[PDB]
């Protein structure tokens, strides 16, 4: 009843006073729990491997006359502990005084032999049990977990069995991406997180240079510079910081991977995306199809099919076609801008302030196009050069660029394009523009939204679920 702590703290101090160390230095375990289940799951009911002493450790998660049961968890797997007065080595002390000290949450060292119960329960049978690290608080009951999960993540990880899955998956995702690129000749680099130079940035102050720096909003410019350097296939997975608002799909600090492929272009990157996504999902599910609760764990889930190829939708054409309106170039012209503001009002969507063309197009696309498909990922392609300042101009469609955005359930996870490489047509940094002048070969570059990808492949509604310690208000 929440005063357990003071009790437990006193007991610890009492243990110290009686000369016993309750936080011992090293216990030499000879096997882990996942191994123990792997090694011993094929013993027959009631069988004991009486002549196999093992040193094993875990965390007690249920303390169940002269006999005691326990639940021992470790690396996310449990076995049972069957301590028996008959089997206890009495030289180490009074059996019932030894086990009456063990609480739920306690971390223990067990010297015993591997066996099974009459029921066929795989267990370990100890001669000796030592307390290695005690749990002083009252641990939440199995399925007793809100907003405790995000602050006290360790508690989430210990009680809620799927929580470990989420984060194991997350790493399998990154491990994949790393290999997928490395196999394809790519070369992982580190670029600076702090700099002198579209999103509002985080600002911080360097002391020994007495200068205000800006935490990076992407990894684009330094990466492109390395292509100039002759590192033809280059990539970086890392944190990036944007100072905008927070929601279920947005978090101020988030993981992103960008790569730059020299001599490639739009079409190569479309192939890349399709190849990567389909394979990744298959690597994790043995199928290109997954279930996904778009509306929540209470509502019916939808099915997403990752079988390539995926649908391509052109940004301009589609909006025209959905509204029966035609949008004359330049898109920033007074006739065309005023036309869009009419469409935003005529369909009653929230209007962006300030109303600049590219910002009006994004909101239009956002409402009309971005919910075209939920059952498969799809691309929105060939964005106008006004939305796409660093992208190469479309080689046949004037005004547009060779740009792609991939969408899963209406949210953006990928963004790539052919890199504008002619320094003249680049109408940002002095160093960057200087690099262009030294010759950037035809390049195609892409970026992934790791956390959003992780959300979809772990069936989560909130980005906070797939980040270990999300940035939260106190």
Ligand X SMILES: N[C@@H](CCCC[NH3+])C(=O)O
The CA distances from residue 313 to 200, 318, 348, 384, 445, in Å, are 29, 7, 24, 14, 20
187 binds ligand 9CF (CB under 6 A): no
The pairing of strands 233-241 and 411-419 is unpaired
User: Which of ligand 9CF, ligand X, its own copies, none does residue 452 bind (CB under 5 to 8 Å by kind)?
Assistant: ligand 9CF
Binding string, 110-129, against ligand 9CF, x = CB under 6 A? Answer: --------------------
- How many residues bind ligand 9CF (CB under 6 A)? The answer is 17
- Of 164-193, binders to its own copies (CB under 8 A) are 164, 167-168, 171, 174-175, 187-193
428 binds its own copies (CB under 8 A): no
User: Which of its own copies, ligand X, ligand 9CF, none does residue 126 bind (CB under 5 to 8 Å by kind)?
Assistant: none
- Of 228-287, binders to ligand 9CF (CB under 6 A) are 242, 244, 249-251, 254, 256
370 binds ligand 9CF (CB under 6 A): no
User: Which of ligand X, ligand 9CF, its own copies, none does residue 349 bind (CB under 5 to 8 Å by kind)?
Assistant: none
Residues 6+ apart with CB under 8 A from 425: 393
The angle formed by the CA atoms of residues 358, 359 and 365, to the nearest 5 degrees, is 85
The CA distances from residue 351 to 2, 254, 343, 370, in Å, are 51, 27, 10, 17
Distance (Å, whole) CA 292 – CA 304: 7
Distance (Å, whole) CA 111 – CA 125: 8
Nearest Cα neighbor of 273 from 419, 467, 397, 408 is 408
* Residue 430 burial (C-beta neighbours within 10 Å; 0-12, 13-18, 19+): exposed
Residues 6+ apart with CB under 8 A from 303: 289, 290, 291, 292, 375
Which two three-digit tokens encode residue 245?
A: 């608002």
222 binds ligand X (CB under 6 A): no
The angle formed by the CA atoms of residues 289, 290 and 295, to the nearest 5 degrees, is 135
Nearest Cα neighbor of 355 from 339, 374, 376, 373 is 339
* Residue 308 burial (C-beta neighbours within 10 Å; 0-12, 13-18, 19+): middle
**Nearer to its own copies by C-beta: 200 or 312?**
200
User: Which of its own copies, ligand 9CF, ligand X, none does residue 416 bind (CB under 5 to 8 Å by kind)?
Assistant: ligand X
130 binds its own copies (CB under 8 A): no
Binding string, 243-262, against ligand X, x = CB under 6 A? Answer: ---------------x----
Q: Which of 163, 415, 418, 435 binds ligand X (CB under 6 A)?
A: 415
Span near ligand 9CF by CB under 6 A; candidates 19-27, 57-65, 128-136, 441-449:
441-449
Span near ligand X by CB under 6 A; candidates 34-42, 47-55, 284-292, 415-423:
415-423
**Which residue ranges make up the site for ligand X (CB under 6 A)?**
218, 220, 258, 390, 415-417, 445-447
**Which residue ranges make up the site for ligand 9CF (CB under 6 A)?**
242, 244, 249-251, 254, 256, 412-415, 447-449, 451-452, 463
């Amino acid at each position: 009843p929440r005063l357990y702590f003071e009790n437990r703290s006193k007991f610890i101090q009492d243990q110290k006073d009686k000369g016993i160390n309750p936080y011992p230095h090293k216990f030499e375990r000879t096997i882990s729990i996942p191994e123990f289940i792997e090694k011993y799951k094929d013993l027959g009911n009631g069988e004991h491997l009486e002549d196999t002493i093992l040193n094993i450790t875990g965390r007690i998660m249920r303390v169940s006359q002269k006999l005691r049961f326990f639940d021992l968890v470790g690396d996310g797997e449990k076995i049972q502990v069957l301590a028996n007065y008959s089997f206890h080595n009495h030289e180490k002390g009074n059996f019932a005084e030894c086990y009456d000290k063990i609480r739920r949450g306690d971390i223990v060292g067990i010297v015993g032999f591997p066996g099974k119960s009459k029921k066929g329960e795989l267990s370990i049978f100890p001669k000796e049990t030592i307390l290695l690290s005690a749990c002083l608080h009252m641990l939440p009951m199995k399925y007793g977990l809100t907003e405790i999960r995000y602050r006290q993540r360790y508690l989430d990880l210990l009680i809620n069995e799927s929580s470990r899955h989420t984060f194991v998956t997350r790493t399998k995702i990154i491990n994949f991406l790393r290999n997928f690129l490395n196999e394809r000749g790519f070369f992982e680099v580190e670029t600076p997180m702090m700099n002198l130079i579209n999103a509002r940035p985080f600002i911080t102050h360097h002391n020994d240079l007495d200068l205000d720096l800006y935490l990076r909003i992407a990894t684009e410019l330094p990466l492109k510079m390395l292509i100039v350097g002759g590192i033809d296939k280059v990539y970086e997975i890392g944190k990036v910081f944007r100072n905008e608002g927070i929601d279920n799909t947005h978090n101020p600090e988030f993981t992103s991977c960008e790569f730059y492929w020299a001599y490639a272009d739009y079409n190569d990157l479309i192939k890349w995306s399709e190849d990567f996504f389909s394979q990744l999902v298959y690597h994790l599910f043995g199928t290109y199809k997954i279930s996904y609760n778009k509306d929540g764990p209470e509502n019916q889930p939808i099915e997403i099919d990752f079988t390539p190829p995926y649908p391509k939708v052109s940004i301009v054409e589609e909006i025209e076609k959905v509204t029966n309106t035609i949008l004359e170039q330049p898109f920033d012209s007074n006739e065309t801008i005023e036309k869009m503001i009419n469409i935003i009002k005529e369909h009653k969507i929230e209007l962006p302030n300030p109303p600049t063309a590219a910002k009006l197009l994004d909101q239009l696309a956002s409402h009309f196009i971005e919910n075209k498909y939920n059952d498969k990922p799809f691309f929105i392609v060939e964005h106008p050069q006004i939305m796409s300042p660093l992208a190469k101009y479309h080689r046949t469609k004037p005004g547009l660029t060779e740009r792609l955005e991939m969408f899963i359930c209406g949210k953006e996870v990928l963004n790539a394009y052919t890199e504008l490489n002619d320094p003249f047509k680049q109408k940002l940094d002095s160093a960057f523009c200087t690099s262009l002048e030294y010759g950037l070969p035809p390049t195609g570059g892409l970026g992934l939204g790791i956390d959003r990808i992780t959300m979809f492949l772990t069936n989560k509604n909130s980005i906070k679920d797939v980040i270990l310690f999300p940035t939260m208000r106190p």
